[PDB]
Amino acid sequence: CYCRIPACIAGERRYXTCIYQGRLWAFCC
Amino acid sequence: CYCRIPACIAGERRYXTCIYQGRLWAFCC
């Protein structure tokens, strides 16, 4: 799994969020 | 970097949070 911005990619799906560097990330797997 | 629960492991520092399965995780690097 990996935090990504702006979105999950390449067949991954979002299963949560991350907050880092004052931005919202998608938590992707 | 890794989302971890309940805490960052030896040598890592917390730089944010994740939310996954309704729990708050530390975002650790």
Swiss-Prot record, chains A, B:
Please name every pair of cysteines joined by a disulfide bond in this record.
C1-C29, C3-C18, C8-C28
Q: Which superkingdom, per the lineage?
A: Eukaryota
Protein name in the entry: Neutrophil defensin 2
Q: Specify the species.
A: Homo sapiens (Human)
Q: Which gene encodes it?
A: DEFA3
Q: Which residues of the full protein are shown?
A: 66 to 94 of 94
